[PDB]
Design a binder for this molecule. Sequence first.
Ligand code: HEM
Ligand code: HEM
Ligand SMILES: Cc1cc(N)nc(CCc2cc(N)cc(CCc3cc(C)cc(N)n3)c2)c1
Ligand SMILES: Cc1cc(N)nc(CCc2cc(N)cc(CCc3cc(C)cc(N)n3)c2)c1
Ligand SMILES: C[C@H](O)[C@H](O)[C@H]1CNc2nc(N)[nH]c(=O)c2N1
Ligand SMILES: C[C@H](O)[C@H](O)[C@H]1CNc2nc(N)[nH]c(=O)c2N1
Ligand SMILES: [Zn+2]
Lengths: 403, 404
Amino acid sequence: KFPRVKNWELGSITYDTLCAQSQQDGPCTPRRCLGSLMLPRPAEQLLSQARDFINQYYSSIKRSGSQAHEERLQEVEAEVASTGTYHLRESELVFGAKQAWRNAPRCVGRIQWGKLQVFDARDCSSAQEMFTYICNHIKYATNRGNLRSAITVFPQRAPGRGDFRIWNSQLVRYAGYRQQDGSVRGDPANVEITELCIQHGWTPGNGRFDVLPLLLQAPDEAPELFVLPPELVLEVPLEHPTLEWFAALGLRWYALPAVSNMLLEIGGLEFSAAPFSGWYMSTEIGTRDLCDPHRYNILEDVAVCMDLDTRTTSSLWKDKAAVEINLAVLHSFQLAKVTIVDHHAATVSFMKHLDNEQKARGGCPADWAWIVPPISGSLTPVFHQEMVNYILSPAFRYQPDPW
Amino acid sequence: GPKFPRVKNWELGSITYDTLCAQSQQDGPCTPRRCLGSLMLPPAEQLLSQARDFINQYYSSIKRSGSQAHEERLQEVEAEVASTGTYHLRESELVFGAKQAWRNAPRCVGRIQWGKLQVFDARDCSSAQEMFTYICNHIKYATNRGNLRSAITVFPQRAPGRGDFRIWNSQLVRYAGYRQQDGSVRGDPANVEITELCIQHGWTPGNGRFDVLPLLLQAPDEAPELFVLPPELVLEVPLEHPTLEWFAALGLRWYALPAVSNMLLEIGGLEFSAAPFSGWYMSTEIGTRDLCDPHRYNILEDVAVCMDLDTRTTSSLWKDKAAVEINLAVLHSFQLAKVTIVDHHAATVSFMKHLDNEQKARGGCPADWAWIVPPISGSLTPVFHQEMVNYILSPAFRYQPDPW
Ligand code: HEM
Ligand code: HEM
Ligand SMILES: Cc1cc(N)nc(CCc2cc(N)cc(CCc3cc(C)cc(N)n3)c2)c1
Ligand SMILES: Cc1cc(N)nc(CCc2cc(N)cc(CCc3cc(C)cc(N)n3)c2)c1
Ligand SMILES: C[C@H](O)[C@H](O)[C@H]1CNc2nc(N)[nH]c(=O)c2N1
Ligand SMILES: C[C@H](O)[C@H](O)[C@H]1CNc2nc(N)[nH]c(=O)c2N1
Ligand SMILES: [Zn+2]
């Protein structure tokens, strides 16, 4: 009923009682576990999610059962009954966005959950306005290299109409241009979005690190194209502390990781555009973005530069090259004074987070496969820690692509 | 789409559907409400039903399903159980069942080799001395002077109110771990308990970092007996590095033969409590886990110091650099000594081949993602980008409680 959770390095045990608060089903059944899959395959229900959430909020400010709490429940009941929906107060939105981050099982960065700047953009009525808000978000979060976590929340989904959406998967992404002979120039993960940007009238570049425009969509309208001013997009040229040829690879990455395709669910309400951003963990760039074979795929090139023996896997050329690239990422961000965290530091701070949440809430939802870094897994404390995954609300969810 | 889990590979963009999971007769630990896949640990006519199912599986695998021989074997099994409460496997049924328990093991990346397993039948064994003889022959065959061969030895099955055959060691070859006066451990900390049990049963202990443990072997309703493995039978590999000359001076070594001795082999409801099985190593098991786990030999710092890394800051990636060199030392030294070993790249490539074989042969393959993905360079291997369905099929290897 309540899972026993063991750490195998330390021998310590806890019990997860928080999981009893889950009201949504994940993908697993007793017959089979689907925990390694990336994606999933009336008024009285909105009302009961709304009550839960308002109960969560008054409990958080230590005012459960108070006058303010009781009247807010009534405001919500009256509004749903008359209209089929309701609206959040700004402070409730602020609390709900922090909770959705806190509740995100795939995020190793949750020790920071309390420190989140929330921009209320729910008075947005046009793609133009979305663009201004997003530029403000980026300027704030970037902070000249001293990165600050942020989320901008555009207007909620409504029964009668289309969604506000950002078509891009992140605010900052490099173009992937499909070539004559089916090779890719740039980031292969962004081929389709690059093609959508072009067909909506973007004049494309022809480099490996061409920052994409945004496609922003106000309800029931064609998406609109907005070029991000180059001065807003902070980037870090990649070089290596001792390998001098490395800088000649012309490699670079952007400071700001900002997710823009996820849906923020709070108290039954859905925010289909609510982009959020923090700072990078070095392995996201050094290992996945640069070394994935279906991404920039630079491993072999680096290994050859290092004069390694590329003909046999057993020389561990791939491992040796991957470490140096992750090292180049860390050194380069440090040198350019741009916030970054390495995978050892991040995972140690996640273990602390696990302990804080154990005392605070009797548990912490975590997806082991996503928490464990993609190199040096067992060299991190999290490798050795059992984890319970489940869905709490407020939540960030996946949603279908708008096109 | 199909009413079965859809499974994607994100590197290649390819899709399969797992139909094999429908044949799972046993619940794992997950529910719709929470996933517990990262956790290391979880008969009147219930036996008949498991036996019938296994016999159906055997008759399928030889293509005699629905035949007269198939129906007669069924009848023979229920009659035996009807009159004695248990039944017994034919030789060829044991061989099939043992290979299928390996095939079915969600945590094993070596499964491409599953059809190639020497099965030693030791169901006539009646004493601890004879268990020892059997085990020694297994070790000789399996080791084959460095050209390793997968093998399993199967001792008599659990019987109605009669003691189990048990091997007390979790592996046939393990290094002692000696609890020191200052709280620390000399040798392998994983093995402090079994080490202290061996002494308690009369072993005279060494005091080294790599003392091979004796076996504690238990025949039915008898105290376990202690058996020292003849040293010439236990092939070890001293560890050296290909370019770092000082690495040899560290005096590290590991044994050639990984052989699990504490797992239960269940076949058709029959339970083989002593059934040691063995293969060859994947290099990360030694150079990443056994040598670098903090709660194991823990040599990362020492190696990083020799390599002159900055061990005072995480962001120098000293741990990552030392671990790569240790894994390379393990591969290099096994190669030089001509002892079969597989690195984590080759192993994982071969496991993807296996997945594609099993998709065609059976419609899926149970796989535990967290165990299959290697402990270093995870996303550098193809298995990282491959979704996996995990579920229990039988025949199976299972954990069982310690005999003490
Ligand atoms: C402050 C620094 C932060 C760090 C170092 C960090 C770290 C990470 C990392 C490494 C991932 C895995 C990314 C991947 O493999 O694609 C991730 C996932 C995620 N994080 Fe964070 N995070 C930070 C801030 C935030 C913030 C502010 C939020 C939201 C308010 C957030 C919410 C999420 C969500 C929803 C996911 C899952 C993304 C998905 O499913 O695709 N994180 N986090
Ligand atoms: C041929 C070479 C083989 C290789 C390279 C190999 C590889 C591995 C590896 C790397 C693991 C993970 C173990 C750990 O981290 O503790 C493992 C687990 C396992 N393998 Fe294999 N294997 C091989 C042969 C065998 C054989 C012959 C059997 C049985 C007949 C077997 C059955 C198992 C089982 C049951 C586990 C899970 C053990 C547990 O849950 O504690 N493998 N294998
Ligand atoms: C098919 C598919 C759909 C979907 N929605 N998401 C994915 C993978 C998720 C993901 C992919 C990338 N490239 C980057 C991030 C930013 C991760 C991040 C966020 C923050 C806020 C900080 C940080 N360090 N990293 C997340 C795949
Ligand atoms: C003490 C203990 C008890 C228990 N119930 N479970 C475990 C974890 C499993 C395990 C642990 C270790 N150290 C070694 C192996 C050999 C794995 C192996 C086997 C074969 C046959 C080949 C190979 N390459 N590796 C398996 C440990
Ligand atoms: C199939 C597998 O679940 C998939 O490759 C996951 C593994 N772990 C991950 N972990 C993180 N942090 N990000 C990822 O994209 C993935 N990919
Ligand atoms: C907590 C987690 O379940 C545990 O540490 C697992 C992770 N993956 C593993 N993978 C393998 N192959 N072997 C292991 O012992 C483990 N340990
Ligand atoms: Zn699961």
